[PDB]
Amino acid sequence: ERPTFYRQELNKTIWEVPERYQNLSPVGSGAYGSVCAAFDTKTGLRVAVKKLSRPFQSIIHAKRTYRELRLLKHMKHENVIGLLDVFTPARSLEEFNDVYLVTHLMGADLNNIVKCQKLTDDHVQFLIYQILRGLKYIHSADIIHRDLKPSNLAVNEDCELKILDFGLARHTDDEMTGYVATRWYRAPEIMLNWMHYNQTVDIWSVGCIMAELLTGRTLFPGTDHIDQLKLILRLVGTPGAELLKKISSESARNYIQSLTQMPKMNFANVFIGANPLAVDLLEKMLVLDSDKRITAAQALAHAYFAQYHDPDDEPVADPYDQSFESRDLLIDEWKSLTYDEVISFVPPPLD
Numbered sequence: 033e034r035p036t037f038y039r040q041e042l043n044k045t046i047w048e049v050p051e052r053y054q055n056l057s058p059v060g061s062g063a064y065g066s067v068c069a070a071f072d073t074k075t076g077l078r079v080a081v082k083k084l085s086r087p088f089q090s091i092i093h094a095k096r097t098y099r100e101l102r103l104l105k106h107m108k109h110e111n112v113i114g115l116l117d118v119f120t121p122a123r124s125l126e127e128f129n130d131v132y133l134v135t136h137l138m139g140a141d142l143n144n145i146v147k148c149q150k151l152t153d154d155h156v157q158f159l160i161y162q163i164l165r166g167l168k169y170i171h172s173a174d175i176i177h178r179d180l181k182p183s184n185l186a187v188n189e190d191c192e193l194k195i196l197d198f199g200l201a202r203h204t205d206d207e208m209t210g211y212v213a214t215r216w217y218r219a220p221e222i223m224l225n226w227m228h229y230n231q232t233v234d235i236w237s238v239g240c241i242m243a244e245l246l247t248g249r250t251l252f253p254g255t256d257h258i259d260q261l262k263l264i265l266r267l268v269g270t271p272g273a274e275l276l277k278k279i280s281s282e283s284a285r286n287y288i289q290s291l292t293q294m295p296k297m298n299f300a301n302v303f304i305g306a307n308p309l310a311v312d313l314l315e316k317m318l319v320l321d322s323d324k325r326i327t328a329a330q331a332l333a334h335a336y337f338a339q340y341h342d343p344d345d346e347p348v349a350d351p352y353d354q355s356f357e358s359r360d361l362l363i364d365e366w367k368s369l370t371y372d373e374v375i376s377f378v379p380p381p382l383d
């Protein structure tokens with residue numbers, strides 16, 4: 033029942049994988065892992081194999097590893113990354129030190145789509161529809177992406193889309209600093225730590241992405257946190273008393289009140305020539321008060337998507353138990369939980 037593994041050194045890294053995976057070829061690497069393209073001879077699929085780097089070197093790392101495996105095993109939706117396989121060459125918990133994750137080989141992301149091709153309004157409709165379809169699904173499980181951006185959206189030749197999270201980087205203060213795409217899609221409340229955030233942080237991101245699909249340009253390309261906030265407030269207007277109240281931070285609240293008050297702009301005069309239905313949806317997503325933003329489920333029933341909307345084919349997720357997130361365990365306990373999840377993995381059906 034345990035497959036045969038073979039060894040191979042690729043870019044100073046040892047890969048021990050089941051024989052089914054052939055033609056391994058380095059594709060990427062970072063702080064959390066190294067990635068190879070391969071051909072899965074069992075399924076006929078081109079796949080990406082990610083070897084996690086030092087998955088159990090600290091408590092934080094071990095919990096992270098467990099978290100990713102739990103999320104990936106849970107997500108089963110056409111518009112979200114699916115786990116094809118997970119394995120370890122280890123024959124026992126005692127020798128368990130490496131975890132490999134397998135998924136469909138991406139190809140293009142939305143970033144190279146928007147930069148390299150012309151998108152009609154029909155393409156924008158279809159692409160955003162699919163992001164929202166996936167978000168309805170993850171949000172139904174109380175899973176928040178928090179880092180939706182074009183580089184995290186995979187798109188095939190037929191314009192079919194999946195949501196993933198590549199973040200092999202640790203998301204430090206420095207990488208959020210300056211003129212960086214890493215921050216341009218982030219909701220203002222998380223960018224500035226205004227308050228406890230909710231799942232409509234992801235809807236803000238969708239609005240930023242949709243705007244960029246329509247114009248071909250970044251909506252809020254700030255040169256730093258403050259410059260970006262000024263771009264935002266210029267479009268959407270400065271907050272009123274009602275939203276200010278909700279900003280828990282006192283200093284953050286005092287800074288906002290130092291700003292000259294600005295009204296919401298006319299979106300038809302920003303997104304010149306866009307479908308009026310697209311403009312209306314943008315106005316409902318790019319709302320400063322996260323309590324008042326449209327949700328994924330509400331947006332799927334918006335008239336902009338009339339061509340694609342099918343309420344019998346917009347499924348929700350099975351319940352996802354996240355109690356582990358509030359739990360403090362030792363490295364070896366997180367490691368043993370992870371090992372159990374590796375061993376118990378069951379592959380999805382073929383077709």
Ligand SMILES: O=C(Nc1ccc2[nH]ccc2c1)c1cc(F)cc(N2CCOCC2)c1
Nearest residue numbers: 080081082100103133134135177195196197
């Ligand atoms: O995409 C992810 N992992 C990933 C990336 C590239 C890979 N190559 C081979 C395996 C592999 C795994 C990923 C990880 C997560 F922790 C959460 C989410 N989700 C996505 C859906 O929204 C919630 C966050 C996606």
